[PDB]
Write a protein that binds this ligand. Structure first.
Ligand SMILES: [Fe+3]
Ligand SMILES: [Mg+2]
Ligand SMILES: [Mg+2]
Lengths: 286, 286
C-alpha cells in the first residue's frame, strides 16, 4: 500500500527469472502473441499500386490519412509500453507479453510506413504524412489524449491500462472498420491483409489489458472507467464524422458512430462492468 | 556537453516515428535480427534424453550448471536493456534493435528453462538451478559483475555498452564452446541446435554493441576498455577452470583459457582497438 498490496506491481525478486510459470492465464496470452509473429516482409504489396491508382482522389486522401494516423499512434502506444507499463509491472509473465508487444508495435509502424511509401512517391507528401502528430489537426486530439496518460504522474495503473485499451480498442476501431469496408469492396489486397493481422494483434493487446485489469486488487470505479471510455468514444466519433469523415469512402457516418459505441460496450463488458450505450453492431463485416 | 553532443543519446523529437530511416547500418542489424526470429517450439528435444542418460554424473552436473548460468545471465542482460539501454538511446533504429533483443532474450531464457525442465524432473533440483544467482557461487561472480554495471550511476553509455558486450561475448564464450564440444561428440542434437541459434543471436548482440560504440563521439580510452575486457576474461577463465571446470566434460582447461583470450582480442579489434593477448584460436570447431 499503495503498491505493495498489488501482486502485479509489488516487488518480485524473481522478475527476471522466467520459470516456473505461476500466472498461466497471462503466460498463455504471451504464448499466443509469440505464435502469431509476423513481419512486414510477409505482406505482398506487389499488386496494390494498380488498385490504388484506380481509386477516387478522396479515397486516396482518406486512406493515406488513416495510415498516417496509425503509424503515429503506434509510436505513442510504444512509448507508453517502453517508459511505463513494461517498467512498473513486476510479474515475469506480463513483462514477456509487453516486451513482445513493443516488438510488434515496431512491426506495425514499419508496415504502415511501407504502405505509405509504396502508395505515395512524392517525398513532400511522405514527410507530411510521417509527421501527422504535428501536421494533421485531426490526429492531434487523439495523440495528445494518449500522451497525457503517459505524463500523468497521479493516475493509477488501473486507470492508465484502461486508457490504453481505449487507445488500442476505441481510437483504432473506426479506422479498422474503414479498411474492412474497403475489403468488402475488393480493393488493395496488401492493405486489407495487413489490416487483418494488425487488428487481430490490437484485439489481443486490448484483451491483455482487460486481463491485467482483472488481476488488480484496487480497481478504479465503474464511474471513473465510464468517463474515460465515454470520453474516448466522443473523440473517436468526432475524428470519423468531422476531422476525417468516413463519407469519403462511401460509409454511413451515423452507423459508424453506432459501431464505435458497440465497441466501447464490448470493452466495458470485458472490463467487468455494464454496457454504457446498449446499441447493436451495425456492421455485419465486423 | 554532456550528452547533447551525442547523436545516439541527444533529444530526438522523432524517436517514436519510424520512417524515414537515417541510420542504415543500425537499421540493417535490426532487420537481420528480425529475419532470424525463432522460438523454443522450433527446437526438438526428443532425441536428447537417451544421450543425457548415457553421460557420466559429472557431465550432467556440468551441463545443468551451464544451463542454469545462462538462464540467470539472460535475465540480467534483459534487465539492463529494459531499464537502461532501451531508455537512454534516442535513435529509432537502435530502439527497434534493443526492443527486438529484449524479446529474443525472453525466448533465450525460455529455451534454457525448457532444457532444464526436459532433462531434470526432480522439482528440488529444478528450483536449485533456477535460483542459480542465489544458489551457485560460480555464477555470483559473473552476475554481480554485470549487475554492478546496471547500478553504476556514473559510468558512461560508452563504458556500459562495452561491459555488456563483454557479458554477451566473454561471459558466454566458454559455455558456448562447451556445448559445441558436445556437438563434436555427437551428443544431444536438441541442446546443440538451440546453442547454434542462441550463440548466433548473442554474436549479433555483440556486433550491435560495437556498432553503437563506433557511433559514439566521446568513447572511453583504449586503456579503460582494456581494463574492462581483461577483467571479464579473468572472471570467465576462473569460471571455466576453477568454479565449473571444463575438464568435467573432457575439455582441456589451458586451451579453454586461450580461447577466452582469443574471443577478447576479436572483441577489442571489433571495437576499434588493438589485440591484448595475441593468441590464436585453439578450437577448430569455433
Ligand atoms: Fe544477447
Ligand atoms: Mg519469475
Ligand atoms: Mg525516428
Amino acid at each position: 500500500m499503495g503498491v505493495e498490496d498489488e501482486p502485479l506491481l509489488r516487488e518480485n525478486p524473481r522478475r527476471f527469472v522466467i520459470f516456473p510459470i505461476e500466472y498461466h492465464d497471462i503466460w498463455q496470452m504471451y504464448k499466443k502473441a509469440e505464435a502469431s509473429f509476423w513481419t512486414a516482409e510477409d505482406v505482398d504489396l506487389s499488386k496494390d499500386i494498380q488498385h490504388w491508382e484506380s481509386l477516387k482522389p478522396e479515397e486516396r486522401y482518406f486512406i493515406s490519412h488513416v495510415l498516417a494516423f496509425f503509424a503515429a499512434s503506434d509510436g505513442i502506444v510504444n512509448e507508453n509500453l517502453v517508459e511505463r507499463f513494461s517498467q512498473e509491472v513486476q510479474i515475469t509473465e506480463a513483462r514477456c507479453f509487453y516486451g513482445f508487444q513493443i516488438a510488434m508495435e515496431n512491426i506495425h509502424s514499419e508496415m504502415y510506413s511501407l504502405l505509405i511509401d509504396t502508395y505515395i512517391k512524392d517525398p513532400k507528401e511522405r514527410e507530411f504524412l510521417f509527421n501527422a502528430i504535428e501536421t494533421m489537426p485531426c490526429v492531434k486530439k487523439k495523440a495528445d489524449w494518449a500522451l497525457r496518460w503517459i505524463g500523468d504522474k497521479e493516475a493509477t495503473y488501473g486507470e492508465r491500462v484502461v486508457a490504453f485499451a481505449a487507445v488500442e480498442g476505441i481510437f483504432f476501431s473506426g479506422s479498422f472498420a474503414s479498411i474492412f469496408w474497403l475489403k468488402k469492396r475488393g480493393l488493395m489486397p496488401g492493405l486489407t491483409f495487413s489490416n487483418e493481422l494488425i487488428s487481430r494483434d490490437e484485439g489481443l493487446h486490448c484483451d491483455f489489458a482487460c486481463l491485467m485489469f482483472k488481476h488488480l486488487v484496487h480497481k478504479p470505479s465503474e464511474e471513473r472507467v465510464r468517463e474515460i471510455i465515454i470520453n474516448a468514444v466522443r473523440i473517436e466519433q468526432e475524428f470519423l464524422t468531422e476531422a476525417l469523415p468516413v463519407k469519403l469512402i462511401g460509409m454511413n457516418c451515423t452507423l459508424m458512430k453506432q459501431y464505435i459505441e458497440f465497441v466501447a460496450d464490448r470493452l466495458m463488458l470485458e472490463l467487468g462492468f455494464s454496457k454504457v450505450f446498449r446499441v447493436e453492431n451495425p456492421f455485419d463485416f465486423m
